[PDB]
Amino acid sequence: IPGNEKLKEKENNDSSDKATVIPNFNTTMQGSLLGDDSRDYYSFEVKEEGEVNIELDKKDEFGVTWTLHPESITYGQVDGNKVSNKVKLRPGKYYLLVYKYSGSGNYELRVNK
């Protein structure tokens, strides 16, 4: 995708206060949940109301999903190596928690309009 930037997560990001910012809607966040690292929190700012697509792509076979809520609840839908949803979001800050329920592995996270 033209201009898509790959950006690494920034640990410690295990709570909402410590969330890694997704600075725009054309970034691919790269993260890992190995061993005792079982939660990676992200945030993003919606500036224009509209449908946002959230897609987590597993790079390894493990049990991982996500939960979104506004600062002011949407769950990832697990389908094999993709965990996705589409949701109409109003302007404001959102908190996107990627967390595992089994195993260990790496993932990429794409939040798009």
Give the residues lining the site for Ca ion (CB under 5 A).
13-14, 31-32, 37, 40
Confirm or reject binding of residue 51 to a second copy (CB under 8 A). no
Binding mask 10-49 for a second copy (x = CB under 8 A): ----xxx-------------------x-xx----------
Buried b (16+ CB within 10 A) or exposed e, 78-96: beeeebeeeeebeeeebbb
Instruction: Provide the total of helices (H) and of strands (E) in the chain, helices listed first.
Output: 0, 11
Contact 68, 96 (CB under 8 A): yes
Contact 5, 28 (CB under 8 A): yes
110 annotated as ligand-binding: no
37 annotated as ligand-binding: yes
Q: Which is nearer to a second copy, 4 or 75 (CB)?
A: 75
Contact 111, 52 (CB under 8 A): yes
40 annotated as ligand-binding: yes
Q: Binds 1, which of a second copy, Ca ion, none (CB < 5 to 8 A, cut-off by type)?
A: none
9 annotated as ligand-binding: yes
Confirm or reject binding of residue 75 to a second copy (CB under 8 A). yes
